[PDB]
Design an enzyme around this catalytic site. Sequence first.
Site, PDB file in Angstrom:
ATOM      1  NE  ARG A   1     -38.072  28.239  11.877  1.00 31.70           N
ATOM      2  CZ  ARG A   1     -39.008  29.141  11.562  1.00 31.70           C
ATOM      3  NH1 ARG A   1     -39.100  30.300  12.210  1.00 31.70           N
ATOM      4  NH2 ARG A   1     -39.877  28.877  10.584  1.00 31.70           N
TER       5      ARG A   1
ATOM      6  CG  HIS B   1     -35.427  27.368   7.887  1.00 33.96           C
ATOM      7  ND1 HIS B   1     -36.768  27.546   7.613  1.00 33.96           N
ATOM      8  CD2 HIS B   1     -35.366  26.455   8.881  1.00 33.96           C
ATOM      9  CE1 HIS B   1     -37.485  26.791   8.426  1.00 33.96           C
ATOM     10  NE2 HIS B   1     -36.660  26.115   9.201  1.00 33.96           N
TER      11      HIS B   1
ATOM     12  CG  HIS C   1     -35.577  21.065  17.442  1.00 36.57           C
ATOM     13  ND1 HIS C   1     -36.235  20.078  16.736  1.00 36.57           N
ATOM     14  CD2 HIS C   1     -35.456  22.116  16.595  1.00 36.57           C
ATOM     15  CE1 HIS C   1     -36.516  20.525  15.523  1.00 36.57           C
ATOM     16  NE2 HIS C   1     -36.050  21.758  15.412  1.00 36.57           N
ATOM     17  CB  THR C   2     -30.972  21.298  23.068  1.00 37.33           C
ATOM     18  OG1 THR C   2     -30.952  21.107  24.484  1.00 37.33           O
ATOM     19  CG2 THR C   2     -29.800  22.197  22.626  1.00 37.33           C
TER      20      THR C   2
ATOM     21  CD1 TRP D   1     -38.483  19.547  20.690  1.00 42.61           C
ATOM     22  CD2 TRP D   1     -38.215  21.746  20.329  1.00 42.61           C
ATOM     23  NE1 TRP D   1     -38.899  19.818  19.409  1.00 42.61           N
ATOM     24  CE2 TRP D   1     -38.757  21.159  19.164  1.00 42.61           C
ATOM     25  CE3 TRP D   1     -37.949  23.124  20.329  1.00 42.61           C
ATOM     26  CZ2 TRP D   1     -39.036  21.896  18.016  1.00 42.61           C
ATOM     27  CZ3 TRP D   1     -38.228  23.854  19.178  1.00 42.61           C
ATOM     28  CH2 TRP D   1     -38.773  23.243  18.049  1.00 42.61           C
ATOM     29  CB  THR D   2     -35.055  21.790  26.789  1.00 41.48           C
ATOM     30  OG1 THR D   2     -34.637  23.112  26.408  1.00 41.48           O
ATOM     31  CG2 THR D   2     -34.621  20.767  25.737  1.00 41.48           C
TER      32      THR D   2
ATOM     33  CG  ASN E   1     -32.000  23.728  29.923  1.00 40.55           C
ATOM     34  OD1 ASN E   1     -32.654  22.983  29.183  1.00 40.55           O
ATOM     35  ND2 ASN E   1     -30.787  23.401  30.379  1.00 40.55           N
TER      36      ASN E   1
ATOM     37  CB  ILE F   1     -29.068  26.157  28.662  1.00 33.62           C
ATOM     38  CG1 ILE F   1     -29.304  27.329  29.626  1.00 33.62           C
ATOM     39  CG2 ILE F   1     -27.866  25.267  29.054  1.00 33.62           C
ATOM     40  CD1 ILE F   1     -28.182  28.356  29.705  1.00 33.62           C
TER      41      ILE F   1
ATOM     42  CG  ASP G   1     -28.809  21.087  28.140  1.00 35.26           C
ATOM     43  OD1 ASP G   1     -29.666  21.003  27.239  1.00 35.26           O
ATOM     44  OD2 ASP G   1     -29.112  21.142  29.357  1.00 35.26           O
TER      45      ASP G   1
ATOM     46  CG  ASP H   1     -38.549  16.543  17.791  1.00 34.71           C
ATOM     47  OD1 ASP H   1     -37.503  16.927  17.212  1.00 34.71           O
ATOM     48  OD2 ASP H   1     -39.416  17.356  18.184  1.00 34.71           O
TER      49      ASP H   1
END
Length: 249
Positions: free
Chosen positions: A38, A42, A163-164, A179-180, A182, A185, A187, A208
């Site tokens: 991030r 930014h 964002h994963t 968001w996930t 994991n 990780i 992916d 999103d």
Amino acid sequence: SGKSYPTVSADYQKAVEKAKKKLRGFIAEKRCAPLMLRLAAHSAGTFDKGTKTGGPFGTIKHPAELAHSANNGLDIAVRLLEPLKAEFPILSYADFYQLAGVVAVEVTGGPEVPFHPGREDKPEPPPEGRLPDATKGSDHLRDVFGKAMGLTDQDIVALSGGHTIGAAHKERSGFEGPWTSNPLIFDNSYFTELLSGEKEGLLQLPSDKALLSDPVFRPLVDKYAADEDAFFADYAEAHQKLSELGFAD
Ligand code: HEM
Ligand SMILES: [C-]#N
């Protein structure tokens, strides 16, 4: 494309190589990869192609830029990196922060994003209000990434996949949660989750969701959800471009 990278001394390149290793260990130990990604985004995302202002030139460390509401929490990132940065006085802050973003992606299992040194630390921070707004949609995404930064529609969807890793914080943006399932990780799960709907415990921003209903963005979402290798290739290309906005032509 269109890039002519500057010459740096052998001592500068030595420091890049050593700093990359130290960043790997530090970022892994501190569990701060998403925050560092991030920070890199930014730093870079303030570039305006028409005026050649903003971009990844070390200005995010300035009190005046950290004060921006969009940058809530990034003071933590800057502070975390200060002791390590001090071990590499020859490196620009501009290069150091972009290297930290590249390493954040690698240590979480993402693609190896090419890195070229030579960004100079610039005196003047860009004006506030250039970064993307989570409450807006596809038109806004094209205004910021396309009209200002000079990136493509493909780059927009691939970069959204950053964002994963990570999460929002109610004390920072106001949004809350990962968001996930994991979030350390790297992916294609960001895209899988976006398609399956609104799962309990997981976050989707309006920005999103805008990817799902746009005629150009949706086929890209579908592609990345089905093909992680295609996501990794497009992500690496897009991150490199973002990290080099305004740099080396
Ligand atoms: C597409 C437009 C984008 C929007 C609307 C957006 C918005 C946001 C928001 C609201 C947060 C939560 C901040 C917080 O409350 O802590 C966030 C976090 C984050 N963003 Fe984005 N962002 C965008 C693009 C990007 C890009 C291009 C990248 C990098 C490739 C990126 C990487 C991240 C990461 C890794 C986090 C997690 C931070 C953490 O875990 O502390 N974002 N973003
Ligand atoms: C995300 N910035």
